């Protein structure tokens, strides 16, 4: 199938390295079971806190092996803010502009792993980008996530320790069933 999928991982100080690693584990589980390929599913990975880091761009080779190795090598960046709005803005202003021609009509999906309320202003993405917020732990701002996600309901997960257990299947069921 043809999809553009963005994973957005919060990697602030409030998340911490241990929990960030669990976010990476979650994401690896998803990507491993996705039909990733140059003509099929494309994946981008962002990490964000104060700034946004592009960990794997849409415009590099869309090979599962390459992406997974890069994912394993991602280093927790830390940061004193959770600039979720900035991460979303990057997707609309950069990431989802990569697909061109026929592929421009493919669905755009965003899977975002956050555990804290946004530090900045959140603006809604264009209608052609579907966002599924994954709020992890008790400090996720449910109302904010519901606002970003609409019409998609956010997936609210107990904590980061449990995130890699079942949440990958919830994600795969929404994207790729």
Ligand X SMILES: *[C@@H]1O[C@H](CO)[C@@H](O[C@@H]2O[C@H](CO)[C@@H](O)[C@H](O)[C@H]2NC(C)=O)[C@H](O)[C@H]1NC(C)=O
Ligand Y SMILES: *[C@@H]1O[C@H](CO)[C@@H](O)[C@H](O)[C@H]1NC(C)=O
The one of ligand X, ligand Y, none whose footprint includes residue 80, by CB under 5 to 8 A per kind, is ligand Y
Binding-site partner at residue 21 among ligand X, ligand Y, none, CB < 5 to 8 Å by type = ligand X
- Print the binding letters for residues 11-50 with ligand X: x by CB under 6 A, - otherwise: ------xx--x-----------------------------
Query: Cβ closer to ligand Y: 44 or 83?
Result: 83
Q: What is the closest distance, in whole angstroms, from the C-beta atom of residue 10 to ligand X in the complex?
A: 15
Nearer to ligand Y, 50 or 146 (CB): 50
From the CB of 13, what's the least distance to ligand Y, in Å? 9
Taking the C-alpha atoms of residue 4 and residue 28, their distance in angstroms, rounded to an integer, is: 16
Residues 122-161 that bind ligand X (CB under 6 A): none
Binding site partner of 69, from ligand Y, ligand X, none, Cβ cut-off 5-8 A by kind: none
Task: Report CA torsion sign: 90, 93, 98, 103.
Answer: positive
- The b/e string for 73-104 (b: 16+ C-beta within 10 A; e otherwise) is ebebbebebbbbbbbbbbbbebbbeebeeeee
Q: Is 24 exposed, middle or buried (0-12, 13-18, 19+ CB in 10 A)?
A: buried
* Nearest partner of 74 among 17, 134, 149, 152, judged by Cα: 17
Whole-angstrom distance, CA of residue 171 vs CA of residue 105 = 21
Q: Interaction with ligand Y in 34-63: which residues (CB under 6 A)?
A: 50
What 3-state DSSP class applies to 172?
A: helix
Interface residues with ligand X (CB under 6 A)? 17-18, 21
Interface residues with ligand Y (CB under 6 A)? 50, 80
């Amino acid at each position: 199938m043809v999809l553009d999928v963005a994973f957005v991982l919060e990697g602030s100080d409030k998340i911490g390295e241990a929990d960030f690693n669990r976010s990476k584990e979650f994401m690896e589980e998803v990507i491993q079971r996705m039909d990733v390929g140059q003509d099929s599913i494309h994946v981008t990975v962002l990490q964000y806190s104060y700034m946004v880091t592009v960990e794997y761009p849409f415009s590099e080779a869309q090979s599962k092996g390459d992406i997974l190795q890069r994912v394993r090598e991602i280093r927790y960046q830390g940061g004193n803010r959770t600039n979720t709005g900035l991460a979303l803005r990057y997707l609309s202003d950069h990431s989802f502009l990569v697909s061109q021609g026929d592929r421009e009509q493919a669905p755009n999906l965003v899977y975002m792993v956050t555990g804290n309320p946004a530090s900045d202003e959140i603006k809604r993405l264009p209608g052609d980008i579907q966002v599924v917020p994954i709020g992890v732990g008790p400090n996720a701002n449910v109302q904010e996530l519901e606002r970003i996600g609409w019409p998609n309901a956010p997936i609210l997960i107990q904590d980061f320790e449990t995130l890699p257990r079942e949440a990958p299947d919830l994600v795969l069921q929404r994207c790729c069933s």
